[PDB]
Amino acid sequence: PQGEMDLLDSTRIHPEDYSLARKMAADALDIEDIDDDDESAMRNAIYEMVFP
Amino acid sequence: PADKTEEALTTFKTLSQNSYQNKTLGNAHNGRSTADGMSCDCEENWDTVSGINNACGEYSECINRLTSIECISGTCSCGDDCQNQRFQKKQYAPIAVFETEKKGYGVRAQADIRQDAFIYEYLGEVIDESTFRKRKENYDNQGLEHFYFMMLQKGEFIDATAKGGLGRFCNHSCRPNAYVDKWEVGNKLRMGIFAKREIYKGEEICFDYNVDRYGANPQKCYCGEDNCIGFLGGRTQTDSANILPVPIAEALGSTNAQEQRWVRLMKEQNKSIKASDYSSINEDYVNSLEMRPIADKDEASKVTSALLKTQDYIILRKLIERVSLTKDPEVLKEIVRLRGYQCVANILTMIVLDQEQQQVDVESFTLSVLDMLESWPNSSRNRISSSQIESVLESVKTKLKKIQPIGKKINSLLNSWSKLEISYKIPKSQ
Amino acid sequence: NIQGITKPAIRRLARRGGVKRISGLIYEETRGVLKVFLENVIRDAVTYTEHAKRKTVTAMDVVYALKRQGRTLYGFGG
Amino acid sequence: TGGVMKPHRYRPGTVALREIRRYQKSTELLIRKLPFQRLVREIAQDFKTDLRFQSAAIGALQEASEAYLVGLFEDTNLCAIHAKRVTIMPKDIQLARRIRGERA
Amino acid sequence: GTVALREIRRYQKSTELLIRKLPFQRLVREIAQDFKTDLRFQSAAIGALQEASEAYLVGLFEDTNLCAIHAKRVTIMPKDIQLARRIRGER
Amino acid sequence: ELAGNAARDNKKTRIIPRHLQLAIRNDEELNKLLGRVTIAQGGVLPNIQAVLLPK
Ligand SMILES: Nc1ncnc2c1ncn2[C@@H]1O[C@H](CSCC[C@H](N)C(=O)O)[C@@H](O)[C@H]1O
Ligand SMILES: [Zn+2]
Ligand SMILES: [Zn+2]
Ligand SMILES: [Zn+2]
């Protein structure tokens, strides 16, 4: 999930909204240890949401 | 006791050698004929006075003797009549039969026998498994109260009931002075009986049976040995299997070895440990248990299960102490996912709201359980909301308001927890 | 398929050398040294074959490479 | 009372010394043919593919590898005996290779 | 123990020969005498023999030190000498 | 010659690589000459250490 490639690069979402999409994905999975500034946890959450 | 040698001999057909149901059974290497038979490199040592070939003796370096294989004449460099032809030459030790108090006939040494010396070759009919089953059923129908079967190898047994030798009269001893061994003679397999120690004249010759009952009922052992297990059976044990349930025992860091050690140290030294039952907790075992930090999430799940199951004060004390030793953040996050706070609420309530103990000891417990609550990583009151343990903390600081260190620690704890939030968290449909 | 050199096989190989007891950690070490030796001999045989303008490695290349490493083999047409 | 007395087990080393004599008397290959062939093909794949390997080349490679491993285990057994042990350890393997010159 | 490390440090940095020249010369002549008599020797041949024998003995002592280290000892023994020679292949 | 003799102690009329390996390794000077050669299907001479044996 922390790799060079990105899940959202295969979607129509603009790169300026990648953190918005990862916050949506993290909040949808009922995670509570998540902080907005932690990009790594956001990427892990969206990876487990799209590719469980 | 009076000799019963001839009387014992008349009870069965005496054999000088093992008889075979067929030529295929009992063959060495599962019948694979090793044409390159194992020839010892010993040089023949003929004593010119007695004309005896002393090669392959006890203190000689015969490889075949060490490997429990007998030299065969005409194949080995040791020559004929070497000192490793004990089975073939039938040079049995001198023995007598005497009537025992409870075991019937038994074998005694007519002379003093050296260590590792060959006593006697166990004789019988070599039979297959089906023949063994048929004979076993027939003898059980006959009501015979004596074992007469030995396992030559897998699927191949030796029967000593109707035909055999004096070795069938040897009685079981739980601390035996002799032992049975398996040897290779030519392309065949033999079962001999050898002296485990120095045995004096008149002493009974006994070996460990190591009985495979094949579902038969236990038979009580009357050997008289102090280390007797009391029954004939290839296995035996004490309460050294479980003292506490497996998830609860592994929650405390205890395993099969630690559950063995406590019972071995006390029960075998005249101190009482009850029969296996987890309804009553033995506090002394839990206090004496060793504690190591947790670094595995399955062990954390077992700890959570133990918290949800065990009601004992002392087990919970030692689990909380183990958690105090534990400092791995991932295990603590797993406990949070398992809602450890929910279990800790009940653990508190049972001890400091219900009062089955003393106020000083409960105070020590409370000081020993507030520390890891203060220490664990926390990022959101959603964690606590799954337990509402703060309410329990308020109730216990209100009850033990006289003990001001507990009150001040709970003040610090609620102050720390109240700073938490969840920034912005998207509401979900309901 | 380095795990194809199974534990009983390497136990047998040690047993031919007269070894009575075997440590539990030795098997990875034997697999490594066998891999190193095979790597060297296979490399030399492959470049011998590539010089010979062939596409199939014959036994002569193997025996040549081994003899050039001071490990002369008798019985394969040397 | 139809039970069977068990022959118990051998001491550690007795069956070891037996199988020592048996394997030192016989001469067959001790490594299975097909896994060794696959391993040789895997090593050869790294340089240039489409390389056919005659059965005689694989057999010669197997014989050389077995001879090398047997010699290494003899030297490592001498090393273990020298250190008053009967169990060989990887440190004896490394030392044997060091003194042999194979490892720099 | 201190001067042992001092001797190691001094001799591992030096390059001159440590075997005395005249006894080695007499040793070479004594060995060569029993193969053929009235043998002459170039000085450079004796020097080459001295250098080669010193290099060989240094290598043997290094391998022997490894063997001694293996047996949890610090003192080298003759059994280390024949162990190193046996493994190295000399008879 | 040495290989035929070694076969003769084995009561065989067939010379095999095993007998050749026995003949080479049991003779000191022949072992010295053929030191660095491996005989295919020759096996190893039976040699068990003295302190390797039990007591
Ligand atoms: N120590 C012991 N106490 C009571 N019975 C024993 C015993 N050791 C052996 N036995 C009995 O002896 C049987 C073995 S056959 C031994 C000889 C036979 N009991 C006789 O006197 O003629 C076993 O099946 C067992 O039932
Ligand atoms: Zn012998
Ligand atoms: Zn003999
Ligand atoms: Zn008993």
Side-chain angles (χ1 to χ4, degrees):
Chain A
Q2 314 295 315
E4 192 67 24
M5 294 182 71
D6 203 332
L7 286 75
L8 303 156
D9 284 358
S10 69
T11 72
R12 293 189 165 90
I13 305 165
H14 199 277
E16 77 184 352
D17 306 320
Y18 283 178
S19 58
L20 176 60
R22 292 193 267 253
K23 186 167 177 63
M24 289 174 56
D27 288 19
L29 292 188
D30 311 299
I31 306 300
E32 63 185 342
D33 184 1
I34 178 64
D35 288 339
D36 287 358
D37 68 304
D38 191 348
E39 186 175 319
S40 184
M42 289 289 184
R43 294 195 65 149
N44 285 348
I46 190 169
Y47 190 93
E48 293 176 352
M49 204 208 66
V50 182
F51 299 113
Chain B
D3 198 338
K4 306 294 184 179
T5 293
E6 300 296 343
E7 191 177 350
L9 284 158
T10 53
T11 67
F12 71 102
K13 176 171 175 179
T14 303
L15 295 179
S16 62
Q17 65 197 35
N18 273 315
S19 61
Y20 313 93
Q21 176 170 341
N22 58 76
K23 301 177 184 179
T24 53
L25 293 173
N27 296 318
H29 305 275
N30 314 335
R32 295 186 173 183
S33 63
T34 53
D36 289 345
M38 301 187 182
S39 170
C40 65
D41 305 333
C42 314
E43 307 182 10
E44 62 191 353
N45 179 17
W46 290 84
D47 182 18
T48 58
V49 174
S50 59
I52 293 164
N53 189 17
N54 312 341
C56 319
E58 187 176 355
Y59 304 109
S60 63
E61 299 191 356
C62 183
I63 294 163
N64 303 13
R65 200 194 190 91
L66 299 175
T67 57
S68 302
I69 302 167
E70 271 206 341
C71 305
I72 302 299
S73 293
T75 70
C76 300
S77 66
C78 62
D80 309 340
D81 301 333
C82 82
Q83 299 292 353
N84 194 15
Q85 311 192 348
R86 293 181 286 178
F87 285 76
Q88 293 171 114
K89 294 187 176 182
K90 299 171 186 177
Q91 297 170 342
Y92 310 138
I95 50 169
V97 186
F98 71 106
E99 189 179 3
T100 59
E101 299 175 2
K102 305 177 186 179
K103 317 183 286 191
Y105 294 148
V107 182
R108 51 179 175 181
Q110 281 175 324
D112 305 337
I113 293 158
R114 296 184 178 182
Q115 185 187 6
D116 305 329
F118 172 57
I119 314 187
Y120 189 82
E121 183 181 3
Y122 191 94
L123 296 175
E125 311 187 13
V126 186
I127 51 172
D128 77 85
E129 186 171 355
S130 56
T131 300
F132 146 77
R133 291 177 183 283
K134 292 176 180 180
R135 289 197 170 191
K136 177 178 173 300
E137 290 174 13
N138 298 330
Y139 302 156
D140 296 330
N141 298 328
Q142 293 153 25
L144 312 188
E145 301 187 356
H146 295 336
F147 304 139
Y148 283 110
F149 289 85
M150 190 183 293
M151 177 176 290
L152 171 52
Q153 57 176 330
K154 187 176 182 180
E156 312 187 3
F157 304 87
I158 294 163
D159 183 15
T161 309
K163 318 188 181 178
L166 300 175
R168 66 207 290 271
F169 295 105
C170 302
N171 293 280
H172 173 57
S173 171
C174 300
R175 186 173 294 183
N177 58 0
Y179 66 99
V180 171
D181 194 352
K182 180 169 66 174
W183 276 60
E184 192 182 7
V185 175
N187 69 327
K188 297 288 188 174
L189 306 183
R190 311 295 196 75
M191 309 303 286
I193 298 158
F194 295 76
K196 179 62 173 171
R197 57 169 187 77
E198 194 70 39
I199 292 163
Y200 302 89
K201 177 170 181 179
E203 301 180 349
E204 197 189 14
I205 294 159
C206 300
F207 71 100
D208 182 14
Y209 285 11
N210 192 28
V211 175
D212 192 317
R213 293 160 179 168
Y214 286 88
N217 306 331
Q219 184 171 7
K220 178 163 175 183
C221 187
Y222 307 86
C223 66
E225 302 283 18
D226 60 348
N227 71 330
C228 179
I229 57 172
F231 297 100
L232 307 176
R235 293 182 183 174
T236 168
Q237 292 177 335
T238 59
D239 305 340
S240 282
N242 271 113
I243 306 155
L244 291 168
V246 166
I248 291 158
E250 291 163 4
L252 292 157
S254 187
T255 55
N256 288 0
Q258 292 192 2
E259 293 168 86
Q260 268 158 7
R261 189 173 183 77
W262 188 69
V263 184
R264 287 205 179 281
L265 284 160
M266 280 201 291
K267 194 186 190 191
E268 291 164 42
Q269 306 190 41
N270 304 350
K271 276 176 180 174
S272 53
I273 291 91
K274 290 181 180 179
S276 64
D277 189 353
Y278 319 122
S279 62
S280 62
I281 292 91
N282 200 326
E283 296 181 18
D284 294 331
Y285 172 56
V286 186
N287 276 359
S288 55
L289 266 178
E290 299 194 347
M291 299 299 166
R292 40 164 173 102
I294 308 160
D296 186 296
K297 292 198 174 205
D298 204 15
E299 296 185 31
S301 180
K302 295 162 180 189
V303 165
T304 302
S305 187
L307 303 196
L308 291 177
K309 286 170 173 288
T310 307
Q311 298 172 339
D312 172 44
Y313 173 52
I314 297 302
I315 286 181
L316 295 168
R317 281 182 81 164
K318 289 312 191 196
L319 288 173
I320 287 158
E321 179 166 18
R322 200 190 178 206
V323 169
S324 80
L325 309 177
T326 297
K327 294 182 181 177
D328 175 29
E330 269 287 6
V331 161
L332 301 177
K333 284 195 184 191
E334 185 56 42
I335 290 163
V336 165
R337 166 158 50 237
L338 298 153
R339 307 178 300 283
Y341 296 113
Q342 184 172 41
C343 314
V344 167
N346 170 43
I347 291 160
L348 285 168
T349 300
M350 187 179 290
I351 300 307
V352 63
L353 292 183
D354 185 17
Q355 276 193 248
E356 296 200 333
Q357 305 293 344
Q358 306 81 11
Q359 287 196 136
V360 176
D361 196 16
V362 168
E363 168 184 8
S364 75
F365 172 79
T366 310
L367 295 182
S368 183
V369 74
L370 282 182
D371 297 331
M372 66 290 298
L373 296 175
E374 185 178 2
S375 78
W376 294 342
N378 289 280
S379 307
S380 170
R381 297 186 72 186
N382 289 337
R383 300 183 174 199
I384 296 142
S385 184
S386 76
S387 67
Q388 304 196 0
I389 183 169
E390 305 188 354
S391 50
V392 183
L393 294 175
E394 294 268 50
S395 306
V396 304
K397 68 179 286 187
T398 308
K399 161 159 171 160
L400 298 195
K401 208 166 185 178
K402 177 176 177 66
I403 300 98
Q404 281 297 336
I406 294 173
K408 197 176 181 184
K409 287 184 67 61
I410 290 174
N411 286 348
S412 165
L413 192 56
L414 297 183
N415 179 63
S416 183
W417 290 1
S418 76
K419 298 183 177 182
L420 291 183
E421 292 177 350
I422 61 171
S423 64
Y424 162 73
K425 179 63 171 282
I426 301 170
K428 295 180 57 166
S429 187
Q430 309 186 4
Chain C
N1 322 327
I2 196 54
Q3 293 177 335
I5 298 329
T6 174
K7 158 207 302 318
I10 176 58
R11 164 181 319 296
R12 290 201 213 89
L13 282 161
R15 207 72 74 185
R16 189 169 268 174
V19 172
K20 190 198 191 168
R21 292 180 106 267
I22 290 303
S23 285
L25 310 94
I26 201 144
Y27 307 118
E28 291 82 12
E29 191 94 3
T30 85
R31 278 179 195 113
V33 59
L34 174 62
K35 187 144 80 72
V36 160
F37 179 72
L38 259 196
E39 163 52 13
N40 293 163
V41 181
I42 273 297
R43 164 141 31 91
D44 283 357
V46 155
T47 166
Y48 267 115
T49 302
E50 291 322 319
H51 178 269
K53 294 179 179 179
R54 281 190 261 103
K55 294 279 189 220
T56 167
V57 176
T58 198
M60 294 300 293
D61 322 318
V62 177
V63 175
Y64 271 150
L66 289 163
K67 157 216 195 179
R68 212 199 51 82
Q69 292 184 30
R71 309 295 292 255
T72 306
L73 182 90
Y74 284 1
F76 285 78
Chain D
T1 57
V4 181
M5 298 173 290
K6 293 179 179 179
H8 329 108
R9 292 173 296 180
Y10 282 87
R11 303 313 153 82
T14 300
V15 176
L17 275 170
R18 278 157 150 208
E19 102 185 328
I20 284 172
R21 293 185 101 259
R22 176 174 75 107
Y23 292 133
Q24 283 189 161
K25 179 62 173 171
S26 67
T27 67
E28 65 292 9
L29 275 295
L30 295 324
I31 308 176
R32 314 289 217 105
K33 288 214 202 329
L34 208 82
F36 190 82
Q37 152 174 354
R38 291 206 216 93
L39 163 69
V40 168
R41 288 182 201 276
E42 259 179 333
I43 300 206
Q45 202 67 341
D46 293 318
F47 307 136
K48 295 180 182 297
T49 59
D50 289 345
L51 259 176
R52 293 182 182 174
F53 275 70
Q54 288 195 335
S55 87
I58 273 154
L61 270 163
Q62 203 163 346
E63 289 274 349
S65 313
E66 289 206 330
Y68 173 80
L69 274 191
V70 164
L72 187 76
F73 274 127
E74 273 184 350
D75 294 349
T76 300
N77 175 44
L78 290 174
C79 290
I81 277 304
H82 178 254
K84 250 62 180 178
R85 282 184 280 106
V86 286
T87 315
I88 46 166
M89 318 285 258
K91 56 185 283 179
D92 319 78
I93 298 279
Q94 292 136 11
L95 184 158
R97 292 235 302 159
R98 265 284 301 101
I99 287 172
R100 274 228 218 160
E102 270 163 25
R103 179 73 69 139
Chain E
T2 299
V3 317
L5 295 118
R6 300 244 291 277
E7 263 167 15
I8 291 172
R9 196 253 178 192
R10 284 198 333 108
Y11 291 133
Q12 282 192 329
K13 87 155 321 197
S14 65
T15 86
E16 61 290 7
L17 301 110
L18 305 174
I19 274 284
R20 197 60 40 87
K21 298 174 136 46
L22 196 57
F24 193 84
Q25 190 167 358
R26 290 201 295 265
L27 179 56
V28 168
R29 295 183 187 279
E30 181 278 357
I31 281 186
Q33 143 185 347
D34 82 7
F35 294 162
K36 186 174 153 43
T37 59
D38 289 345
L39 257 180
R40 284 195 168 202
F41 268 88
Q42 287 196 337
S43 61
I46 279 151
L49 277 162
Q50 203 166 253
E51 189 47 53
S53 59
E54 281 178 22
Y56 166 72
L57 281 176
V58 163
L60 186 56
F61 276 141
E62 162 50 12
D63 288 351
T64 280
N65 197 51
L66 258 174
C67 295
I69 274 298
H70 187 67
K72 294 306 183 245
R73 282 184 281 106
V74 70
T75 312
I76 62 166
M77 306 268 300
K79 35 191 292 182
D80 311 311
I81 292 325
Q82 37 265 26
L83 182 74
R85 289 184 37 103
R86 148 65 60 81
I87 278 182
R88 267 161 89 118
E90 298 77 319
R91 271 76 191 255
Chain F
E1 183 178 2
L2 292 184
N5 286 30
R8 203 201 74 260
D9 319 273
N10 209 285
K11 301 103 174 181
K12 299 284 188 298
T13 60
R14 287 276 48 83
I15 287 171
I16 41 175
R18 179 67 166 123
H19 301 143
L20 291 174
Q21 164 77 330
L22 286 171
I24 293 169
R25 293 299 119 82
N26 205 28
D27 179 340
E28 211 276 327
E29 293 177 350
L30 279 178
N31 174 63
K32 223 183 291 173
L33 177 63
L34 284 76
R36 312 281 271 120
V37 297
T38 88
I39 302 310
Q41 302 224 60
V44 168
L45 260 55
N47 192 7
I48 295 184
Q49 305 256 340
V51 307
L52 179 63
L53 286 160
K55 200 65 64 69

